[model samples]
Target: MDTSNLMEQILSSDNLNRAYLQVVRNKGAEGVDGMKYTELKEHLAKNGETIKGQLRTRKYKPQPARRVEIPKPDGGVRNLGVPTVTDRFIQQAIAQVLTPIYEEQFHDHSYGFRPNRCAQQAILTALNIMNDGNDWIVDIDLEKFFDTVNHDKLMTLIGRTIKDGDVISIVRKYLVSGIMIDDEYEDSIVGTPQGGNLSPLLANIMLNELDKEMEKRGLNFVRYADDCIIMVGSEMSANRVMRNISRFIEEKLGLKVNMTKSKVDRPSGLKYLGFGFYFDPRAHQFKAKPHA
Candidate 1:
């Protein structure tokens, strides 16, 4: 209870005293630790010390790993549990969005190449920096974005945008209609968006269409999956583009852009998916993080 009595009891307990001293001496001398039984006992015991039993009498018991609950994704394709976007969807989404941008570079020339993230970043940075007169950047994001995209609009975009020779429809069908992840990811998939093998393709179709619209309207956009960034001139253009893009996604493609989560800024330090109009300090290179 008192300091002197506490010290006396601690010192009197042979196991406790030995362990305490060894811990201190070892820690002080070598700056390293080796497991000591006496310290283990001290750790298990409470207060200044009641000599219960020999410290090494018991074996160590490890606590179970904490249960981590990962919320089921809403749109995966496992039948027994949550639904996830199938591999087919991932590929299709990439194809649809990147195809037109790819075409703009090489459809006729046939010096063909696919869109690479690194290449796109380089082009965006070069254009933005070289054309310094252009200021203000904008990006548009859709809500439940993947699920809400209208299939018909996507189909239409595919038909209109891809040149006659490419295997656009084949890619769409392969990715969207037959897609699935595992049995655990079924319920989260609201519709064909989950089970369809061509969901990604369909989604990509929608992205390409959005990109085309941007080009038509004299707006510049970067399309990567469902994350889109568009450049605008002013508050009016930024807002107008945001509203128009959301409505276009919803009405034209049946996709909803979560306006609450959707943010608009006039040339700040952050760029979405490596696309923005602000000053980026990192090598002045525009590369989107996978998470963003």
Candidate 2:
């Protein structure tokens, strides 16, 4: 068969409807990003990747994303402990039983469920620290937060924490085959299957782990996926904390903070996750944006 003809056959074969349990079971309508067949083939060829549907960037890679550990850094394998049932009848009954309750309980316009909550915790903690004429800084990353994620760190993180977990398995079903990056340095965010099944979760977990160690030495982390705001209480404190964070991440995770990426890799008036934060007359206040 000609390629186009074969493509048409495959793409058109699965039409979603209420009767089709696969769509419902997979949350395809809501979660799966839809894409055209040609686009799918192009992604597969160029990036060695293919996704079930076209995913909206906003829906998948939003701020305050879930921090999870999937089975593999490449994202396949089963989620170990997540609740599952082999019996179809019971699954449907349970879904039906809980659907109404879920809908009623969470009908608000929440940007990100677990992710935002995590960000909130990180931010609130930073605010609680009292600053006395201190130089606390936060950096804002506007593009490719996950794209810049160090591959080595990602692999190590998965191997150490997410291995054989239930969430890992649940992430496997949506794993894309491959990821690719272009040769040009112009791209801010570049990766194959840009937002993978567990990209947000994986990113969050890695960040969380890094943050925990920082807290031990008096550094604070507030992040929404790639967008992050780090705060310190005083100039001495900021210097001490930032240095420790950079060194420890390199030591433990093999991920080094890029001093070249920022002006000095230590700025009190920095922006993070679209918000700018700087010291304003002895108070941590918001600014329109980071100063270039």
Candidate 3:
């Protein structure tokens, strides 16, 4: 909890080396701010202290990522922001410093971006639970989840577990910065920058409250980032649970549910995180469908 120890862990040469290696592994293109990867790497190599100082003082401003709209299978287009190499390096360092503290607080059902947890494990766990009852699966999706996150709430959530003042302040400054869309630039009132390295970690922190709420309500649920799955005994129960959850998210968390994408259905008809599920009568169990 000491500031000196936190800084030593975050800005240490070894941490910097790991962070720098992560940037290289990403092979990112030029940042939205037009800084080449090579240039950013050289800058970090030559002026590590300046970067460290900026982090310590919460004076760093991360550049917005270049936005690329990609088409979804559902016939919708989604924007993907690609962060700059420098921003990624800083993000990686921050992640290294903070993830360990909060990762333990995360529920076992959470499988997004956490170490050794992935979509496959989540699906398998969900399937294993499904065979136990006549439960219907509810798929809940957040509307523009990454873009609509409330920065103040996220900071408060992070501060709950992360006691270091400087770390919290630096993260708060990162969350406060605005992004650019082509020639137009606007300040962000809510949400973490989607393309930034720490966005997933921040999002997980924001949603951990929801996870805890679900647990308190005794609902069978699993969440991967913004995507949520809840198992209930009937469609009626699913509806009731959905309303409670939707209200909690909108009223308490200040986030909106994507009504069209969120649904309650039979497990046999559900597809989650690229894996599908179906009840196999012969196997006498709910089984995973082949994935592409």
Candidate 4:
């Protein structure tokens, strides 16, 4: 990957941003360790090497998450946990280094979390392609994608594209770091925390593999994080594409496909990211789905 400059970015002390400190503080609560951004920046400056070495050597013992449960508008409660390391600015640093490099490699069809590329663009692109007469719209939803990412597989993917050893080691340590639920420290042998700063980028990287597979199979698709859609001409073709994609995701990536939500249906209208799409007969083209 010719990551010499990327590695330099990762380790550059000048890359630390005071603005990021404000971001951490604005989160409204201390991380699991109860340390605020005030202390964190100092700690990083003084013991940057120590922390890096500890992570690389697997000597850093992670603290338990500070759990917070919030009610979903859908009448369900969601558990959100904050890891101690989250406030340390490590994620911001790593992301700054990796995002620019990784963004260059991501498929143009991918829109999730990429700078200047919004969900509207993804929907518009899909609609533009769907204008002709493909009837079957396959909306694919992964079962707990953020909570069930295969850590080993993610690391393998990282190793393939990112050549920085320190970056890899830190990620490895972070993945293995155990989480605590009500005093029970459970070793997170798999899955990246949904709330972690690195999770989004890592998730994108992991799913880029699926994007490659879809490209190889010549499927018409768009993805924004876990929201994936594919258009096909017939039910039979939809079934075939769905089966192949489901099998690849489950077997190759070790992630579960949410069968109930993942279905082949008519494109009367479809919701993707925040935008909606429907066929406009008068205009003879798919248009942004009207708001309720």
Q: Give the best candidate by lDDT.
A: 3
Q: What is the C-alpha local distance difference test score of each model?
A: 0.41, 0.35, 0.73, 0.67
Query: In each prediction, how many residue pairs overlap at the backbone (N, C-alpha, C within less than 3 A)?
Result: 43, 22, 1, 0
Cand. 2 TM to true fold: 0.44
By the TM-score metric, which is better: model 3 or model 4?
Answer: 3
Model with the higher lDDT, candidate 1 or 2? 1
> lDDT per residue, candidate 4, 1-292, as tens digits?
5864464565466665632553454443456777765566676677767865665454655555566775643456756656664433665667777888898889989977677876667877788667766658877778756568777888888888887776787766656553222111112112223354565677788889889999998888888776789888888998988898999999999889988888887766565554555777798887775333
Kindly list the per-residue Cα lDDT of model 3 for residues 108-151, writing each as its tens digit: 99977677876677878788778778468878878765567777
Candidate 1: list runs displaced more than 4 Å. 1-131, 152-200, 269-271, 274-292
- Sorted on lDDT, best first, the list reads 3, 4, 1, 2
Candidate 1, TM-score vs. the true structure?
A: 0.44
Model 2 residue 151 CA deviation in Å: 5.2
Model 4 Cα shift for residue 167 (angstroms): 1.7
Model 3 clash tally?
1
C-alpha lDDT of candidate 3 relative to the true structure? 0.73
Q: Which stretches of candidate 2 lie over 4 Å from their true place?
A: 1-135, 138-156, 159-197, 263-268, 277-292
Measured against the true structure, the TM-scores of the candidates, in listed sequence, are 0.44, 0.44, 0.86, 0.80
